[PDB]
């Protein structure tokens, strides 16, 4: 099982900033573009909001390092 909508909304969220232009969301294999919103997990791995929210709806760990998010 995955995370409640409340736990998910409690995770960090920031707008794209120019330094993110060089980074790639591992879930959609796409470089961040302006307007995007990025979520940064406790283990410090970052994703598009819609990308990791979709995964955390039915799962509980980081796509990259498999550490528990909570």
């Amino acid at each position: 099982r995955g995370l409640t909508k409340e736990q998910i909304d409690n995770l960090a969220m920031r707008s794209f900033g120019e330094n993110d232009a060089l980074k790639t969301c591992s879930v959609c294999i796409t470089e961040y573009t302006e307007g995007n919103k990025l979520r940064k997990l406790p283990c410090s791995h970052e994703y598009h909001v819609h990308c990791i929210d979709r995964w955390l709806s039915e799962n509980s760990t980081c796509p990259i390092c498999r550490r528990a998010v909570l």
Binding site: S26, V27, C28, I29, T30, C51, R54, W55, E58, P63, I64, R66
Partner: protein, 154 residues
């Protein structure tokens, strides 16, 4: 209709197709069989130094509309003598069950499968009798696996 996660899956497969053509994993190729982006075919060469050396193995790959949030279905279409691959072509590989991650790619899947051909996991067997033979009568296991590779995969 939210079936629009077809768009998510298709965009991701389309990018992976480009990347796996320009930078395929060693001794593997893969691509769509036809017009359906979700149904691929793949060739794997038996890893050099292993009992599968000189084999040419074919795999089916089916992505779901949920990809990459659910693992692709990958099955061997060539017979192979291997304790983690049964006669249905089912592959016992953790990242294809509950160790799947959306950061994985089909290239990574093919690399793991090659790694599994090189080093089987007899602690998690699909073909128990092959695992048991691998651990107790290694030489007999390797003799028969080489005979299978020659007869069924060349």
């Amino acid at each position: 209709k939210t079936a629009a996660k077809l768009s998510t899956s298709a965009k991701r497969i389309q990018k992976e197709l480009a990347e796996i053509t320009l930078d395929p994993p060693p001794n593997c190729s893969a691509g769509p069989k036809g017009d359906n982006i979700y149904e691929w075919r793949s060739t794997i060469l038996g890893p050099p130094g292993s009992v599968y050396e000189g084999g040419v193995f074919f795999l089916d790959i089916t992505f779901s509309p949920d990809y990459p949030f659910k693992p692709p279905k990958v099955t061997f279409r060539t017979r192979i003598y291997h304790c983690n691959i049964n006669s249905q072509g089912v592959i016992c590989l953790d990242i294809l069950k509950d160790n799947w991650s959306p950061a994985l790619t089909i290239s990574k899947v093919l690399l793991s499968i090659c790694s599994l051909l090189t080093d089987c996991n007899p602690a998690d067997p699909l073909v128990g009798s092959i695992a048991t033979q691998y651990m107790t009568n290694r030489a007999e296991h390797d003799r028969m696996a080489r005979q299978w590779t020659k007869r069924y995969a060349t």
